[PDB]
């Protein structure tokens, strides 16, 4: 079929609003509470993330409010591919 | 070649010796054609030289084939006591029925004695 | 027959009809005046075949 970063384990879907700075990313998920993603060191080299890139992250059971952590990105050949299956509704990106 | 629950006649012992120990010396010189249903065609032709038919096989369905084919051919033969020295007389270790081998060499006086003994004994 | 399912076919033209006499590949094979080698093997065996490079 296809190998896509679905929610495996406890993953989250990160669609960011603004970069306050130094790696903090305010994310706007379907969950509601303002989460603030940060980044590991394996990908800070070869990839390039910005706004509008729906990507996958991972949250942390501490306070479940401001969490998230990048593990892998999405390429433009998947971001809109993930619409027809309805796995994610894009109206969590226009309001 | 029936099972001992078939009283055809008796079984002497010089026959057993000089035709069962008469196979090793007869295998290391010629050609062995073991098994029951392997030689049936060659004796149907009449190719069998020294056929030694057994008494171990059951049930009484494919046990008697040369005795009923006896009165149609010449069959220089003997009767067989058992199976262990019969598989081991030539070849393998399984239950053997009739090691009826063509040209058993260097072992001809045992033929000239026992084949004609069992000739003039019965058929 | 279990000898009818690992046996090839006798081609007689097309890239699959000839292979190098020393390496064994199909593709760029030299057929000038008869010898049948790669373009890669002919280059590291030629000075023993008699050839020389003058220009």
């Amino acid at each position: 079929v296809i190998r896509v970063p679905l929610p495996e384990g406890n993953q989250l879907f990160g669609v960011v609003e603004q970069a306050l700075g130094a790696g903090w990313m305010d994310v706007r998920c379907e969950d509601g509470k303002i989460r603030r993603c940060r980044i590991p060191g394996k990908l800070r080299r070869r990839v390039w993330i910005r706004v509008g890139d729906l990507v996958i992250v991972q949250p942390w059971p501490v306070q479940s409010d401001k969490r998230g952590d990048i593990v892998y990105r999405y390429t433009q050949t998947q971001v809109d591919w993930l619409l027809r299956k309805g796995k994610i509704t894009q109206e969590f990106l226009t309001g | 070649m029936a099972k001992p629950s078939y009283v055809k006649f008796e079984v002497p012992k010089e026959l057993a010796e000089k035709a069962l120990q008469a196979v090793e010396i007869a295998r290391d010189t010629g050609k062995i054609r073991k098994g029951t249903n392997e030689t049936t065609k060659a004796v149907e032709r009449g190719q069998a030289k020294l056929v030694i038919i057994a008494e171990d096989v059951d049930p009484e369905e494919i046990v008697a084939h040369l005795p009923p084919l006896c009165e149609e051919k010449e069959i220089p033969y003997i009767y067989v006591p058992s199976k262990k020295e019969l598989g081991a007389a030539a070849g393998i270790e399984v239950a053997a029925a009739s090691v009826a081998i063509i040209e058993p060499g260097k072992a001809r006086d045992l033929v000239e004695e026992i084949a004609m003994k069992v000739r003039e004994l019965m058929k | 027959a279990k000898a009818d399912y690992n046996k090839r076919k006798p081609r007689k033209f097309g890239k699959g009809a000839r292979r190098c006499i020393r390496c064994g590949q199909y593709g760029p094979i030299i057929r000038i005046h008869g010898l049948m080698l790669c373009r890669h093997c002919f280059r590291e065996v030629a000075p023993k075949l008699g050839f020389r490079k003058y220009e």
Binding site: - | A42, E61, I62 | -
Partner: protein, 50 residues
Amino acid sequence: MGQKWKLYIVKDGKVIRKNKFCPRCGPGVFMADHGDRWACGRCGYTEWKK
């Protein structure tokens, strides 16, 4: 693996074996009893069995 070599019609006192020899090879090797042809089993033969 069972046991199957029999029914080569046979009694006591005389024998007349059921299936004939093979005309292709030497005598001794038998033919089929399929019911429409004597296939000869291995050599190929379709005389529409007699």
